[PDB]
DNA sequence: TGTTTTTTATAAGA
DNA sequence: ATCTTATAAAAAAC
């Protein structure tokens, strides 16, 4: 199954996340479940 | 109708 | 309420 978000997008979200933005809007906006996000970017990694 | 890869809800957190 | 995390069920591929 295709990863939820291509590499680039990671580079993109990795940013937003480190500048603030909530793991929920991103999830929403990017159309991907919150759990997926805590997976790619664990809380203990910011 | 079957295997594999990744998602994603969900339940649980000395 | 809230935020995190591992998981267990299943979707999305072909």
Swiss-Prot record:
Chain's role: A DNA fragment of approximately 900 base pairs, adjacent to the fljB (H2) gene, which specifies the synthesis of phase-2 flagellin, can exist in either orientation with respect to fljB. The orientation of the inversion region controls expression of fljB. The hin gene occupies about two-thirds of the inversion region; it is required for the inversion of the fljB controlling region.
Domain of life: Bacteria
Protein name (Swiss-Prot/TrEMBL): DNA-invertase hin
UniProt lineage: Bacteria, Pseudomonadati, Pseudomonadota, Gammaproteobacteria, Enterobacterales
Range of residues in the leader sequence: none
Family to which this protein belongs: Belongs to the site-specific recombinase resolvase family.
Residues annotated to bind DNA: 23-42
Source species: Salmonella typhimurium (strain LT2 / SGSC1412 / ATCC 700720)
